[PDB]
Amino acid sequence: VTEAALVRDILYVFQGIDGKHVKMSNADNCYTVEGKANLSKSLRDTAVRLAELGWLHNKIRKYTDQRSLDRSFGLVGQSFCAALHQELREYYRLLSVLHSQLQLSLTLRRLLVWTYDPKMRLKTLAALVDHCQGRKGGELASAVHAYTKTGDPYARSLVQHILSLVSHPVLSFLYRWIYDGELEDTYHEFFVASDPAVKADRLWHDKYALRKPMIPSFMTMDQCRKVLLIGKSINFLHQVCHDQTPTDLENAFQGKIDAAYFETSKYLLDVLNKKYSLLDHMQAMRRYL
């Protein structure tokens, strides 16, 4: 019958919906065209021939909703859905353009021709949807980094830009954990964890902690060990000295961080020499004890 109505069903599938006459084969998350569509069975097969759209567009919609489901999915995880929102805005503009083209001619051939690139982008988004399976914290960072060295810049450049995007949340949290010594994740997905039950003497080793379970796709084992050491020095100031002191860009943030780590270690050592008087305690323990 009405074959151009399939274009409406296709747009609905692009939005993750079935048309009024072309239902959604939700078992495959794809389109289920009406078999009672007494039309060119060639047209039905060809209309199917691009129907795997729903198998990603609706599934990615479900994935984004699941990302919004958890209230402890991580604020960075929400920033992941923020980039998902930006991609959704691009797709919404694309769907608006699709409706504009659908205002009264064109054909399904041009729809697929124009959709080929949109299908490529949706497949790119669905790929990252898979690479975010239950991954949390630094585990999530590594799962996102599952497409680090990918080619085909249509998705590889997007992956790099997204990594720059979302690193800034984690980067800010980690910088607070180093400079300000701020790492209090109630969700406890922070690689620089903490133990808020250590008296100053035990806190020097237990004020912070190394939650290796979520370690960043970028924070290396050294960039976590030295980071925890710098945080421990800041905590030594925080409790032993009872004070605090002053301390995307990934390939060279480590060098500046290590420079600041050495500087902070020297500052902490000097403040220990003044306040802690470990030398005076040893002098007493030697002259007397």
Added chain:
Amino acid sequence: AEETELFELAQAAGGAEVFKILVDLLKLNVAPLAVFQMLKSMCAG
């Protein structure tokens, strides 16, 4: 006071004694470690 909310929390606990003297200790902001030691000691009697 929140005696009703304390009973709400107790029913949430779904156990088998309002126990809000411990909520008074919470108002004093007693520590969990001493609280656990005290709970074990009070259990032993």
Added chain:
Amino acid sequence: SEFRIHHDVNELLSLLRVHGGDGAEVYIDLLQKNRTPYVTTTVSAHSAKVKIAEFSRTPEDFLKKYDELKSKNTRNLDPLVYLLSKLMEDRETLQYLQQNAKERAELAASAAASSGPTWQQSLELTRKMLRDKQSKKNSGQRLPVLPAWVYERPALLGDFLVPIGSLPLASQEAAVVEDLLYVLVGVDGRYISAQPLTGRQGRTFLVDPNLDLSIRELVSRILPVAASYSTVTRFIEEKSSFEYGQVNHALAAAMRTLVKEYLVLVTQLEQLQRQGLLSLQKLWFYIQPAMRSLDILASLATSVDKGECIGGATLSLLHDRSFSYTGDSQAQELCLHLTKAASTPYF
């Protein structure tokens, strides 16, 4: 007082049927040097909640209360949750407490037998009780409270209190857009209806039968932000109560300032609407820009109201939200702005 252990912990030893051992006297001494004026409960609360639910034989009520207790946003529910989880860890401690309690429960039992949500009513009770509370705090002073006439003139904000049997698909989309625009302005739809807020709500929509299943599904996204906006207007009015507070009034006014942005976007879309150059998908694209922001704004308002946030209650809720609104970087900054402004109301 300073010796409140005598009232609580010493009676914990006596009444808990724990006279042997240290009772709760040494427990009083343990909690005495561990009782702080502030709270320092930094802990993986999600981990503690998981442990509690894991040990919860009937975890339905456990998880439900894990959400419900935050409805009131009471004082330090995390310590009680951790206590309820860690005490389930020691069955010997649990069994010993059962010995200390159940026997006294049997004694008491033996000694015993010998000898709907209307937004109007929920807010009126709150307003009267808050007027009484502000009078008690005044202790002989008047109040710049909202007027009785302010409570009167129902729908004082002008609140949100067509045959499409065979409309063409385009005409149906246009009529649905008109209905949804009226709803966004808090007005009735064209071919469908919307029952009023079922107390704390916006408008409980009643979709037209002639609204297409696809049309109804697309409208389903709109209805969330619509109910959010209606409830947001109601919450702004609630915070406008002097009982809500002058700081609550400042928060409501800041919301009204952003609410102008809402009506601004309504008119921005109305530009194309009067032009007749809009579309259902185009509208959805434009709404996505701030449809989420509508619910985000209503979120903090519901947090304050549901916690009845008076004093630093809403302030703490706001600051925590600002610390968590990241990911939604827009809300991370907007709540910071509201915090910085409304601090001065108390600051």
Added chain:
Amino acid sequence: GPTWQQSLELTRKMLRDKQSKKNSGQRLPVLPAWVYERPALLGDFLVPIGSLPLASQEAAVVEDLLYVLVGVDGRYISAQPLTGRQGRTFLVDPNLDLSIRELVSRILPVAASYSTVTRFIEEKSSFEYGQVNHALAAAMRTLVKEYLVLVTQLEQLQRQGLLSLQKLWFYIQPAMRSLDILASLATSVDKGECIGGATLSLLHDRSFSYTGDSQAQELCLHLTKAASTPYFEILEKWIYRGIIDDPYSEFMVEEHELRKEKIQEDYNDKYWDQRYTVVQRQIPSFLQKMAGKVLSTGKYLNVVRECGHDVTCPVAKEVVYTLKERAYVEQIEKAFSYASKVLLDFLMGEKELLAHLRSIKR
């Protein structure tokens, strides 16, 4: 007929097993599965008018052969999907214009190659050919888009009734002009199952074979340049920058584990003697030619690494492999010489081999 799904499930499985067995941190272009099911989105071949005249029956034949040549199915005339890397086997109206059917049969190599090309693009979507092979799939999609522009012009003409089966055959001859340009490289990439620079050498071979055929010659010289650009990333990392890169570990140098402990433990070094082997299978012609100097240069880059300097010479550029051998060798050799010079400077500085010998004098 031939095997495509089976050929893919065997060759791609073997290639993925090879890439992941020897990953050792090396990546491999693993492909996803979220849109592979929900079929009828890939491109394979998705009214009785025989009494209609040769023009009219050939009209229905061409209407269905638009789908067949598009790797789709028509109304009456349809091609049963051809097994293997091919199109579909024609089965047109037996009462349609059999002469127009034979003319389209002459143009039919375009469809037989077209469904095959869709399958080949999906095999590239099976990325284990490489991340650079995934960037290749981008150019493949671009060429499909140009063909789609031509097909859209054809569809508009057909909707206006301005498209004829004979005009379609004449354009298919112009379309076949670029299809023969591509078919050879498509087969070489897919059927050859070249792994790493094995395909890079096959790409240079395709450039040298399809040179002159502008649709193939330009796409091969530019493909060599672009692959050198991905090769530029990988090499500039491993050779120039000395930060070995393994998007598929498909480089021309086998990242033999530079084991510092085994370098200073046994007679045969591992950091110094096994700093990196050569993966002579995943190497191009010009890439391996530069590799000749870049092996000592790559040894020097690993040496800079161990000197705390896994970094590049002042220029990390890799000679982009183009039709010019110097374009693919002279810049890589310059990078290799600079790496050797940087290693010389590091030795005269931090390594202090002469100072060690002077102190090992007494």
